[PDB]
Write a protein that binds this ligand. Structure first.
Ligand code: MG
Ligand code: MG
Ligand code: MG
Ligand code: MG
Ligand code: MG
Ligand code: MG
Ligand code: MG
Ligand code: MG
Ligand code: MG
Ligand code: MG
Ligand code: MG
Ligand code: MG
Ligand code: MG
Ligand code: MG
Ligand code: MG
Ligand code: MG
Ligand code: MG
Ligand code: MG
Ligand code: MG
Ligand code: MG
Ligand code: MG
Ligand code: MG
Ligand code: MG
Ligand code: MG
Ligand code: MG
Ligand code: MG
Ligand code: MG
Ligand code: MG
Ligand code: MG
Ligand code: MG
Ligand code: MG
Ligand code: MG
Ligand code: MG
Ligand code: MG
Ligand code: MG
Ligand code: MG
Ligand code: MG
Ligand code: MG
Ligand code: MG
Ligand code: MG
Ligand code: MG
Ligand code: MG
Ligand code: MG
Ligand code: MG
Ligand code: MG
Ligand code: MG
Ligand code: MG
Ligand code: MG
Ligand code: MG
Ligand code: MG
Ligand code: MG
Ligand code: MG
Ligand code: MG
Ligand code: MG
Ligand code: MG
Ligand code: MG
Ligand code: MG
Ligand code: MG
Ligand code: MG
Ligand code: MG
Ligand code: MG
Ligand code: MG
Ligand code: MG
Ligand code: MG
Ligand code: MG
Ligand code: MG
Ligand code: MG
Ligand code: MG
Ligand code: MG
Ligand code: MG
Ligand code: MG
Ligand code: MG
Ligand code: MG
Ligand code: MG
Ligand code: MG
Ligand code: MG
Ligand code: MG
Ligand code: MG
Ligand code: MG
Ligand code: MG
Ligand code: MG
Ligand code: MG
Ligand code: MG
Ligand code: MG
Ligand code: MG
Ligand code: MG
Ligand code: MG
Ligand code: MG
Ligand code: MG
Ligand code: MG
Ligand code: MG
Ligand code: MG
Ligand code: MG
Ligand code: MG
Ligand code: MG
Ligand code: MG
Ligand code: MG
Ligand code: MG
Ligand code: MG
Ligand code: MG
Ligand code: MG
Ligand code: MG
Ligand code: MG
Ligand code: MG
Ligand code: MG
Ligand code: MG
Ligand code: MG
Ligand code: MG
Ligand code: MG
Ligand code: MG
Ligand code: MG
Ligand code: MG
Ligand code: MG
Ligand code: MG
Ligand code: MG
Ligand code: MG
Ligand code: MG
Ligand code: MG
Ligand code: MG
Ligand code: MG
Ligand code: MG
Ligand code: MG
Ligand code: MG
Ligand code: MG
Ligand code: MG
Ligand code: MG
Ligand code: MG
Ligand code: MG
Ligand code: MG
Ligand code: MG
Ligand code: MG
Ligand code: MG
Ligand code: MG
Ligand code: MG
Ligand code: MG
Ligand code: MG
Ligand code: MG
Ligand code: MG
Ligand code: MG
Ligand code: MG
Ligand code: MG
Ligand code: MG
Ligand code: MG
Ligand code: MG
Ligand code: MG
Ligand code: MG
Ligand code: MG
Ligand code: MG
Ligand code: MG
Ligand code: MG
Ligand code: MG
Ligand code: MG
Ligand code: MG
Ligand code: MG
Ligand code: MG
Ligand code: MG
Ligand code: MG
Ligand code: MG
Ligand code: MG
Ligand code: MG
Ligand code: MG
Ligand code: MG
Ligand code: MG
Ligand code: MG
Ligand code: MG
Ligand code: MG
Ligand code: MG
Ligand code: MG
Ligand code: MG
Ligand code: MG
Ligand code: MG
Ligand code: MG
Ligand code: MG
Ligand code: MG
Ligand code: MG
Ligand code: MG
Ligand code: MG
Ligand code: MG
Ligand code: MG
Ligand code: MG
Ligand code: MG
Ligand code: MG
Ligand code: MG
Ligand code: MG
Ligand code: MG
Ligand code: MG
Ligand code: MG
Ligand code: MG
Ligand code: MG
Ligand code: MG
Ligand code: MG
Ligand code: MG
Ligand code: MG
Ligand code: MG
Ligand code: MG
Ligand code: MG
Ligand code: MG
Ligand code: MG
Ligand code: MG
Ligand code: MG
Ligand code: MG
Ligand code: MG
Ligand code: MG
Ligand code: MG
Ligand code: MG
Ligand code: MG
Ligand code: MG
Ligand code: MG
Ligand code: MG
Ligand code: MG
Ligand code: MG
Ligand code: MG
Ligand code: MG
Ligand code: MG
Ligand code: MG
Ligand code: MG
Ligand code: MG
Ligand code: MG
Ligand code: MG
Ligand code: MG
Ligand code: MG
Ligand code: MG
Ligand code: MG
Ligand code: MG
Ligand code: MG
Ligand code: MG
Ligand code: MG
Ligand code: MG
Ligand code: MG
Ligand code: MG
Ligand code: MG
Ligand code: MG
Ligand code: MG
Ligand code: MG
Ligand code: MG
Ligand code: MG
Ligand code: MG
Ligand code: MG
Ligand code: MG
Ligand code: MG
Ligand code: MG
Ligand code: MG
Ligand code: MG
Ligand code: MG
Ligand code: MG
Ligand code: MG
Ligand code: MG
Ligand code: MG
Ligand code: MG
Ligand code: MG
Ligand code: MG
Ligand code: MG
Ligand code: MG
Ligand code: MG
Ligand code: ZN
Lengths: 64, 100, 149, 107
RNA sequence: AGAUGGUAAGGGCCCACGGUGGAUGCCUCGGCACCCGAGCCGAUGAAGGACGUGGCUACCUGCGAUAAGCCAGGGGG
RNA sequence: GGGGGGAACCUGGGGAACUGAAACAUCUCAGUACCCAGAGGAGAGGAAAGAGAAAUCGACUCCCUGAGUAGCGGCGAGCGA
RNA sequence: CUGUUGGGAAGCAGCGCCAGAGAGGGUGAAAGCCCCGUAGGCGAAAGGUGGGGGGAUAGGUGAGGGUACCCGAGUACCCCGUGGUUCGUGGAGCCAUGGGGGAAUCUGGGCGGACCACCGCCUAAGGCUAAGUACUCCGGGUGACCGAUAGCGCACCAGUACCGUGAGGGAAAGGUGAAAAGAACCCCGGGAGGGGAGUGAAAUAGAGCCUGAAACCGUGGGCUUACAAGCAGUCACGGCCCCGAGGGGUUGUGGCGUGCCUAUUGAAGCAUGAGCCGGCGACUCACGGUCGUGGGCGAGCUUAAGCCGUUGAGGCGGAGGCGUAGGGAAACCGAGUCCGAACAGGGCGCAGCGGCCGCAAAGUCCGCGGCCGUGGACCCGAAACCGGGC
RNA sequence: GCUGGGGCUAGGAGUGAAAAGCUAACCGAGCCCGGAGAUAGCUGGUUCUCCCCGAAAUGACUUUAGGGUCAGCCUCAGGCG
RNA sequence: GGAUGACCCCAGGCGGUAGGGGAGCGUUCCCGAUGCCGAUGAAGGCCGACCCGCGAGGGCGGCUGGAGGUAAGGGAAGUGC
RNA sequence: ACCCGGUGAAAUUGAACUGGCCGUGAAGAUGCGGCCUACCCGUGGCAGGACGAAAAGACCCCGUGGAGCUUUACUGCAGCC
């Protein structure tokens, strides 16, 4: 039967035009009071997942 | 493209022959047989005969060296299986519309 | 050209790999599976795209983001597809959404928005939207922007 | 529904194949289950018989061996040639076998 | 003094021919799949059975004390 | 008139567990297996107190597609209009 | 049809013929013309069907105006408990309903995802309804389906023998020959069995029957062996025997030499498995994905279900899918966009060869191959768990 | 007390002067058929030939430790040079 | 070198478990085939000190067998113990 | 039990042309080294060895295996309030 889109990945991640995989930096969900502003700010960006980890996530998204 | 190439291949060999009509063939094998001899088909070479004339297909079908088809049925396995291609103009007409 | 002559081009039809058929093949006994463990077993491993041996997975440690939607689902709103000026080059006279659908440029169910990559051509282009630069290039090349609503 | 038999007891048949190809004879018997006929004096075999009341002195008898019905062809009683059969409908109209070479009935 | 061959109770290898056994090939009354067709039976006692039934009849088939069958129509020769 | 039978198919009334979740309870397996009742050559459904945004369509059934979309989900495994 | 070889002609040879029939099966071997068929035609007194054609019958059919009589009740509706839906308590509507409460008759009511308004949609609480759909006990047709360890459990007297109190389990077992011509009679023997005779093209086709492998048992022959130390061979030489400057068989002496498989750091290993032989026996298929690859077309590529045709003929079908633009949670903007006060900085994006022609290419479709996902997913194996019965 | 015949109670159930005894020759949960090809990160087994290359037994993390994910190390195809 | 995988010449590499890759052999079936081989003997069996091939194998001969078999080139798998 | 006539099993079995010592070897050798010893084949007997046979160790550990049992483990259900 056809493959299913993994909804947890669909909800965390985006495949960019050239097929990199992009996600939010981890670590500002909470426990933030003593984090510097450099930290909070930088954790506010997206990052490009390491190739082996991205290639795996990509196969979970067969129809994006 | 396949259809067209197959007909093209027989054409390039001289083995494709177009005909206006079929003399006296009115549904009898010996009638087609006569006409054939006269048309250069001694039966030493297998023939894919394509025509909408039912009366002509019945006359020829039983001959071991003849495969018959309506023009809507022209297909490459049959062209490639046989040594010579023989067509009605009316047949040749539909084939031209199909490869368009 | 006869039946005995019909061949696939080299490489067009490759042989399959057969395992577990003898030593000379170099794929006998273990059938290229190595020795023992889960992956050698019939049924094999867990989905290697996700599973990581029991530790929290790479994917599941990344944060979710944005609106995921709620029952009763997607909210119906007009959707726009852009098609650039350069794609309009091929037409002469008029362009309308319907035409662009036919040519295979605009997908059905999307409204038309014209965009600015390329040069404008003095055509009457009818559409639901224009970008700033599309409007400019078109007005400048003497073409006629018509807005649908 | 019935085995088809082109030949019957006892019209006259040419034995057209086998060791006895060429012989002519009356069909003594038709055996439809085996699809076979007995033709008079054709396919003779030697059979052993025990010294018995039926056969004191014992020794052997000659028996006619059945032939596959397809080996046999009726001889037309009009023209005298071996023939295939055709059927013809009469005015009754019963149907009959007729020689296929000339037109004659074969009974 | 010295030295070297013919022994085979039996055994071993090879060859020949057999016995056992039933592979292999060929074969097909049978099976399998798909497609088409067709689709209810029963108190007017079904499905499915028991016991019978032949001049001689173990079983199977058929049949039911009218018992490998009774009457009539059609087919066939 | 009913009763009883019929290989699958069908509707209705009931309805598991292994397993999967690399443990497990919600979840899955699955309204499946299976029991029961009933129908029939099919059964069910069917002529809008519908759909759901089109100023629209127009009973029901069944196939393709819409779409693994929308969503649902110890937002896990998965489930899925 | 004839000739010919042959047990047999359908083989080979000579000369013919049919074909809307050269599908296929038989006949003593290999047959268009011998048989059964095949193409093309024909056919029902009786019973069944009859969705097609015809006929009948039931049944159907108006407009203003007024009246406010009727328009499905323990129902709607609300609350509580649940189920159904993609919806697992969620912002949880809708449909259904076990408990409680409980209306109205169009100025009535239900619905459009809490709720409210507005704007629309629809008429609950009675019933029926062909067809298009599912299945295959049954009949037929057809296989890049099996061919007796296969294929149904059963080709055969099988749901049998047999096993089990019972539910229930559940086999093995096909082939003489063209034809029985199935071997009269004699001989040995109680018989079985054999030897002659006879049949047959063939009888090591003789019924314990086609072929008749291998393990296994034997008779006969060649070479060899009773002072010798062995994973059984191998290399060398010599002897003997055989077929005929060579080969084959055998093996006295000399040299060398730790079975196979499995699992292991490491096995000849005193670690697993295997008595031997034959046969059966384990990486596949569908659908999706990802790469590679052979082609087709290329800013485009491609059709699905179906419909027409065919009866091993293909065509139509553009609904839809992938691609042609990205960025952003989104509104939204767009070769950009997001963060930002920023025209700052940054993230993620954007930009063929030759001579208008050809050539290559995005991409996409089909084939092929590797690997992945979902399925039992390479085969075999639990102890267990659950349902219904005995 | 023993015994014949005729009866009743059964599977998380019976029955038990109690041994988890017995319930059709193996009962800490009977047997048959079914879910069913349960699951088995374990053991076993995995079948023609030739040619080229040719590892690992480490690190991180892991209800993980004889199982995995990534990296390391092998190999193929394309590119660079 | 010759132009192209025609073959010759010079040089170098060629131990290998897991494992990657390449090239082939053979089994069943389909197209090729209304053809071709076949009773002057099919398949299958038993021999062979012979021929070709690195090999898997393929030829050829004799005996058995008695009715089937199937090429060059391709296609598909219940394909090798 | 033994001998003669009659009938005639079994587990097990890679194959076997199956000696001793001292060593060696995956650490207890008929099978390797060196030596020693030994003509070929049985019958009745003995049990030291062939890590003899049988039984995929029951102890032990391991498996995110199973089951029976317990409780102020967790969660639920019957029952009762
Ligand atoms: Mg999630
Ligand atoms: Mg965070
Ligand atoms: Mg947190
Ligand atoms: Mg936050
Ligand atoms: Mg927060
Ligand atoms: Mg600090
Ligand atoms: Mg700071
Ligand atoms: Mg900020
Ligand atoms: Mg899509
Ligand atoms: Mg995209
Ligand atoms: Mg023909
Ligand atoms: Mg032909
Ligand atoms: Mg293939
Ligand atoms: Mg091999
Ligand atoms: Mg390989
Ligand atoms: Mg290897
Ligand atoms: Mg092995
Ligand atoms: Mg591998
Ligand atoms: Mg592998
Ligand atoms: Mg392994
Ligand atoms: Mg390993
Ligand atoms: Mg192994
Ligand atoms: Mg392991
Ligand atoms: Mg492994
Ligand atoms: Mg393995
Ligand atoms: Mg395993
Ligand atoms: Mg398994
Ligand atoms: Mg597993
Ligand atoms: Mg979304
Ligand atoms: Mg203008
Ligand atoms: Mg008749
Ligand atoms: Mg004659
Ligand atoms: Mg009559
Ligand atoms: Mg001497
Ligand atoms: Mg001797
Ligand atoms: Mg002697
Ligand atoms: Mg010896
Ligand atoms: Mg023998
Ligand atoms: Mg065959
Ligand atoms: Mg029926
Ligand atoms: Mg009856
Ligand atoms: Mg009877
Ligand atoms: Mg009578
Ligand atoms: Mg009658
Ligand atoms: Mg009558
Ligand atoms: Mg009833
Ligand atoms: Mg009924
Ligand atoms: Mg139900
Ligand atoms: Mg009920
Ligand atoms: Mg229910
Ligand atoms: Mg229950
Ligand atoms: Mg569960
Ligand atoms: Mg399971
Ligand atoms: Mg899973
Ligand atoms: Mg689990
Ligand atoms: Mg698990
Ligand atoms: Mg557990
Ligand atoms: Mg569970
Ligand atoms: Mg499952
Ligand atoms: Mg469920
Ligand atoms: Mg049910
Ligand atoms: Mg079922
Ligand atoms: Mg019923
Ligand atoms: Mg119907
Ligand atoms: Mg109906
Ligand atoms: Mg109905
Ligand atoms: Mg109504
Ligand atoms: Mg879509
Ligand atoms: Mg569900
Ligand atoms: Mg003669
Ligand atoms: Mg003749
Ligand atoms: Mg001739
Ligand atoms: Mg025909
Ligand atoms: Mg034929
Ligand atoms: Mg024939
Ligand atoms: Mg012939
Ligand atoms: Mg033939
Ligand atoms: Mg014939
Ligand atoms: Mg007809
Ligand atoms: Mg007919
Ligand atoms: Mg009125
Ligand atoms: Mg009123
Ligand atoms: Mg109403
Ligand atoms: Mg009422
Ligand atoms: Mg409620
Ligand atoms: Mg629910
Ligand atoms: Mg929620
Ligand atoms: Mg809800
Ligand atoms: Mg209620
Ligand atoms: Mg109202
Ligand atoms: Mg109201
Ligand atoms: Mg309502
Ligand atoms: Mg409501
Ligand atoms: Mg509402
Ligand atoms: Mg609504
Ligand atoms: Mg509505
Ligand atoms: Mg109804
Ligand atoms: Mg109708
Ligand atoms: Mg219907
Ligand atoms: Mg059907
Ligand atoms: Mg059938
Ligand atoms: Mg066959
Ligand atoms: Mg058999
Ligand atoms: Mg069988
Ligand atoms: Mg056999
Ligand atoms: Mg049967
Ligand atoms: Mg069987
Ligand atoms: Mg059998
Ligand atoms: Mg029997
Ligand atoms: Mg019992
Ligand atoms: Mg019994
Ligand atoms: Mg049983
Ligand atoms: Mg058996
Ligand atoms: Mg026979
Ligand atoms: Mg016979
Ligand atoms: Mg014969
Ligand atoms: Mg006597
Ligand atoms: Mg006798
Ligand atoms: Mg004798
Ligand atoms: Mg005798
Ligand atoms: Mg004779
Ligand atoms: Mg002869
Ligand atoms: Mg013989
Ligand atoms: Mg014989
Ligand atoms: Mg025998
Ligand atoms: Mg035979
Ligand atoms: Mg024999
Ligand atoms: Mg024999
Ligand atoms: Mg033998
Ligand atoms: Mg001897
Ligand atoms: Mg001495
Ligand atoms: Mg000596
Ligand atoms: Mg030696
Ligand atoms: Mg020497
Ligand atoms: Mg020699
Ligand atoms: Mg020598
Ligand atoms: Mg050595
Ligand atoms: Mg050794
Ligand atoms: Mg060693
Ligand atoms: Mg070996
Ligand atoms: Mg082993
Ligand atoms: Mg081990
Ligand atoms: Mg070990
Ligand atoms: Mg160890
Ligand atoms: Mg050893
Ligand atoms: Mg040993
Ligand atoms: Mg041991
Ligand atoms: Mg051992
Ligand atoms: Mg072990
Ligand atoms: Mg054994
Ligand atoms: Mg042996
Ligand atoms: Mg074997
Ligand atoms: Mg595979
Ligand atoms: Mg693929
Ligand atoms: Mg591709
Ligand atoms: Mg194309
Ligand atoms: Mg798609
Ligand atoms: Mg920027
Ligand atoms: Mg091109
Ligand atoms: Mg392409
Ligand atoms: Mg992969
Ligand atoms: Mg499965
Ligand atoms: Mg599987
Ligand atoms: Mg797999
Ligand atoms: Mg199992
Ligand atoms: Mg148990
Ligand atoms: Mg349990
Ligand atoms: Mg339980
Ligand atoms: Mg139970
Ligand atoms: Mg029960
Ligand atoms: Mg008493
Ligand atoms: Mg008593
Ligand atoms: Mg009693
Ligand atoms: Mg009693
Ligand atoms: Mg009691
Ligand atoms: Mg009881
Ligand atoms: Mg009971
Ligand atoms: Mg129990
Ligand atoms: Mg109890
Ligand atoms: Mg007591
Ligand atoms: Mg029992
Ligand atoms: Mg018991
Ligand atoms: Mg007991
Ligand atoms: Mg007991
Ligand atoms: Mg238990
Ligand atoms: Mg239990
Ligand atoms: Mg059952
Ligand atoms: Mg299951
Ligand atoms: Mg399974
Ligand atoms: Mg488990
Ligand atoms: Mg286990
Ligand atoms: Mg294998
Ligand atoms: Mg190397
Ligand atoms: Mg390590
Ligand atoms: Mg980690
Ligand atoms: Mg940890
Ligand atoms: Mg943990
Ligand atoms: Mg390991
Ligand atoms: Mg493990
Ligand atoms: Mg790795
Ligand atoms: Mg490297
Ligand atoms: Mg690599
Ligand atoms: Mg390279
Ligand atoms: Mg090498
Ligand atoms: Mg290579
Ligand atoms: Mg390969
Ligand atoms: Mg070849
Ligand atoms: Mg083979
Ligand atoms: Mg091959
Ligand atoms: Mg076939
Ligand atoms: Mg043919
Ligand atoms: Mg043939
Ligand atoms: Mg010939
Ligand atoms: Mg002959
Ligand atoms: Mg011969
Ligand atoms: Mg062959
Ligand atoms: Mg064959
Ligand atoms: Mg050979
Ligand atoms: Mg031969
Ligand atoms: Mg034949
Ligand atoms: Mg062939
Ligand atoms: Mg071929
Ligand atoms: Mg081909
Ligand atoms: Mg197999
Ligand atoms: Mg004595
Ligand atoms: Mg004795
Ligand atoms: Mg030995
Ligand atoms: Mg010795
Ligand atoms: Mg030592
Ligand atoms: Mg040892
Ligand atoms: Mg020692
Ligand atoms: Mg020794
Ligand atoms: Mg040695
Ligand atoms: Mg020693
Ligand atoms: Mg020594
Ligand atoms: Mg000594
Ligand atoms: Mg002794
Ligand atoms: Mg001892
Ligand atoms: Mg003793
Ligand atoms: Mg020992
Ligand atoms: Mg001992
Ligand atoms: Mg022991
Ligand atoms: Mg042992
Ligand atoms: Mg075991
Ligand atoms: Mg063990
Ligand atoms: Mg153990
Ligand atoms: Mg213990
Ligand atoms: Mg331990
Ligand atoms: Mg444990
Ligand atoms: Mg645990
Ligand atoms: Mg573990
Ligand atoms: Mg556990
Ligand atoms: Mg437990
Ligand atoms: Mg109480
Ligand atoms: Zn005549």
């Amino acid at each position: 039967p056809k493959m299913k889109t993994h909804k947890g990945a669909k909800k965390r991640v985006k495949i960019t035009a050239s097929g990199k995989v992009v996600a939010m930096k981890t670590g500002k969900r909470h426990l933030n009071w003593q984090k510097s502003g450099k930290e909070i700010r930088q954790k506010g960006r997206k990052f490009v997942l390491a190739k082996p980890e991205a290639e795996r996530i990509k196969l979970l998204l067969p129809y994006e | 493209k396949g259809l067209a190439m197959a007909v093209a291949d027989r054409a390039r060999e001289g083995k494709l022959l177009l005909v206006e009509a079929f003399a006296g063939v009115n549904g009898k094998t010996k009638e087609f047989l006569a006409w054939a001899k006269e048309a250069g088909l001694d039966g030493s070479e297998s023939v894919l005969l394509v025509t909408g004339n039912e009366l002509v297909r019945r006359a020829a079908r039983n001959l071991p060296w003849v495969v018959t088809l309506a023009p809507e049925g022209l297909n490459v396995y049959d062209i490639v299986r046989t040594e010579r291609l023989v067509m009605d103009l009316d047949a040749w007409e539909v084939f031209q519309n199909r490869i368009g | 050209m006869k039946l005995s002559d019909l061949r696939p081009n080299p490489g067009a039809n490759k042989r399959r790999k057969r395992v577990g058929r003898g030593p000379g093949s170099g794929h006998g006994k273990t059938a290229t599976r190595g020795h023992k463990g889960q992956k050698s077993r019939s049924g094999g491993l867990k989905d290697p795209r996700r599973f990581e041996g029991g530790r929290s997975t790479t994917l599941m440690r990344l944060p979710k983001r944005g609106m995921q939607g709620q029952v009763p689902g997607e909210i119906k709103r007009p959707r726009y597809q852009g098609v650039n000026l350069k794609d309009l080059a091929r037409f002469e006279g008029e362009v309308t959404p319907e035409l662009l659908v036919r040519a295979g440029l605009l997908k059905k169910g999307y409204r038309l928005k014209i965009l600015g990559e390329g040069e404008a051509k003095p055509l009457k282009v009818v559409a639901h939207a224009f970008s700033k630069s599309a409007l400019e290039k078109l007005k400048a090349a003497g073409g006629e922007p018509v807005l649908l609503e | 529904m019935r085995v088809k038999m082109h030949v019957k007891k006892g019209d006259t048949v040419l034995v057209a194949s086998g060791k006895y190809k060429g012989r002519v004879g009356k069909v003594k018997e038709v055996l439809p289950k085996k699809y076979a006929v007995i033709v008079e004096g054709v396919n003779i075999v030697k059979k052993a018989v025990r010294v018995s009341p039926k056969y004191p002195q014992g020794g052997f008898i000659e028996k006619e061996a059945p032939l596959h019905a397809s080996k046999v062809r009726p001889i037309c009683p009009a023209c005298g040639k071996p023939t295939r059969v055709r059927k013809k409908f009469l005015e009754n109209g019963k149907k009959i076998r007729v020689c296929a070479k000339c037109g004659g009935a074969l009974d």
